[PDB]
Amino acid sequence: ITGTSTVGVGRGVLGDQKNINTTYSTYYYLQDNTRGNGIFTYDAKYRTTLPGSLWADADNQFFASYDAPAVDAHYYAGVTYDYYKNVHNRLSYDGNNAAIRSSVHYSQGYNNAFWNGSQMVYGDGDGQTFIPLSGGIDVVAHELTHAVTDYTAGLIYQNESGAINEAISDIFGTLVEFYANKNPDWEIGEDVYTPGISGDSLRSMSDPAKYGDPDHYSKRYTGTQDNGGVHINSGIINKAAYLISQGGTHYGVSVVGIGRDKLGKIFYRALTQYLTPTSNFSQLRAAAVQSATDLYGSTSQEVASVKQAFDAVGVK
Numbered sequence: 513i514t515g516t517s518t519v520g521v522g523r524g525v526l527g528d529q530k531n532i533n534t535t536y537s538t539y540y541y542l543q544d545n546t547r548g549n550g551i552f553t554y555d556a557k558y559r560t561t562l563p564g565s566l567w568a569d570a571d572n573q574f575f576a577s578y579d580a581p582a583v584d585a586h587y588y589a590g591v592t593y594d595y596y597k598n599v600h601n602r603l604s605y606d607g608n609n610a611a612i613r614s615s616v617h618y619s620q621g622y623n624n625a626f627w628n629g630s631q632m633v634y635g636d637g638d639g640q641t642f643i644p645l646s647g648g649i650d651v652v653a654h655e656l657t658h659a660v661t662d663y664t665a666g667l668i669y670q671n672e673s674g675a676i677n678e679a680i681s682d683i684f685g686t687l688v689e690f691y692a693n694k695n696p697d698w699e700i701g702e703d704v705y706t707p708g709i710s711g712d713s714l715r716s717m718s719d720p721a722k723y724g725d726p727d728h729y730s731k732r733y734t735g736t737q738d739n740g741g742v743h744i745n746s747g748i749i750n751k752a753a754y755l756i757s758q759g760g761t762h763y764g765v766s767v768v769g770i771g772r773d774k775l776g777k778i779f780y781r782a783l784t785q786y787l788t789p790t791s792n793f794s795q796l797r798a799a800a801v802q803s804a805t806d807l808y809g810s811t812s813q814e815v816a817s818v819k820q821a822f823d824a825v826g827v828k
């Protein structure tokens with residue numbers, strides 16, 4: 513909507529106070545004009561009709577319980593926009609400053625978040641498996657990264673291409689969490705998962721097998737569940753990415769870590785230049801090796817580490 517850019521204040525899902533960019537026109541709306549062609553947050557009002565209504569507030573103070581998921585969706589979309597712009601020189605998910613739209617309060621008891629082809633959508637959780645899913649910066653960034661994938665490599669959401677799609681969202685979700693620098697880790701979803709259990713998460717990049725996901729190509733899931741295991745076999749790629757950044761010896765194969773910035777550069781260039789809708793794991797290895805070669809040179813440590821990481825997880 514047309515109005516004047518304002519700055520509101522609120523509390524997120526975890527009870528932390530933050531400022532948010534709003535727009536005033538009779539009401540204060542969750543519309544951030546400071547980034548691209550805007551970031552817009554909507555109320556789905558416990559229904560499944562999307563997007564719902566652009567979030568309106570009478571006083572530009574967002575401290576009600578009902579507000580908290582909106583605050584976080586809106587703020588973390590901004591952080592994610594900033595990461596892609598500042599770190600990768602990418603303007604929004606399409607590279608041309610597309611408006612970023614999110615809806616919160618989707619459905620009832622909904623233990624999921626998603627990118628629907630056009631916008632991000634966040635459940636509230638059931639309060640047992642999840643609390644509102646926008647409370648996780650890694651979750652927000654995971655979802656916005658689906659949009660980046662769809663505009664770039666376009667990895668088909670099944671089997672190996674789908675597992676790469678998933679891993680790319682976990683990787684950049686994690687890199688965004690490190691960019692924001694609040695309790696960062698190589699775990700996925702820990703801020704919003706199981707409020708009754710401390711120290712767990714939905715997936716782990718550092719140790720995918722902790723949560724039953726494969727950490728080696730020989731352990732890949734070959735069935736038909738989960739679109740051919742897209743959230744399962746992502747563990748193989750997540751582990752490779754973790755190793756490229758942090759190093760380690762895995763199944764006897766030693767990898768010299770090169771750190772998160774270089775991981776992000778390698779994978780961003782692979783995603784945007786080399787991967788295609790049908791890329792498989794072997795092709796991702798080649799894309800990453802070529803990307804590291806472009807950036808750092810064929811004889812570089814970075815290239816060597818990429819090869820060792822994919823060797824460690826059994827991807828040739």
Ligand SMILES: O=C(O)C[C@H](NC(=O)OCc1ccccc1)C(=O)O
Pocket residue numbers: 623624625626627645650651654655678700701714
């Ligand atoms: O399964 C689905 O419908 C989509 C799936 N959503 C999903 O797993 O929602 C919760 C969550 C998302 C990211 C990180 C941690 C938790 C996806 O985004 O890949």
Ligand SMILES: [Ca+2]
Pocket residue numbers: 569570571572573574575
């Ligand atoms: Ca208010």
Ligand SMILES: [Ca+2]
Pocket residue numbers: 689694695696697702703
């Ligand atoms: Ca964390």
Ligand SMILES: [Ca+2]
Pocket residue numbers: 650686689696697698699700701702
């Ligand atoms: Ca995390």
Ligand SMILES: [Ca+2]
Pocket residue numbers: 702705706707708709710711712713
């Ligand atoms: Ca937990």
Ligand SMILES: [Zn+2]
Pocket residue numbers: 654658678681
């Ligand atoms: Zn996903």
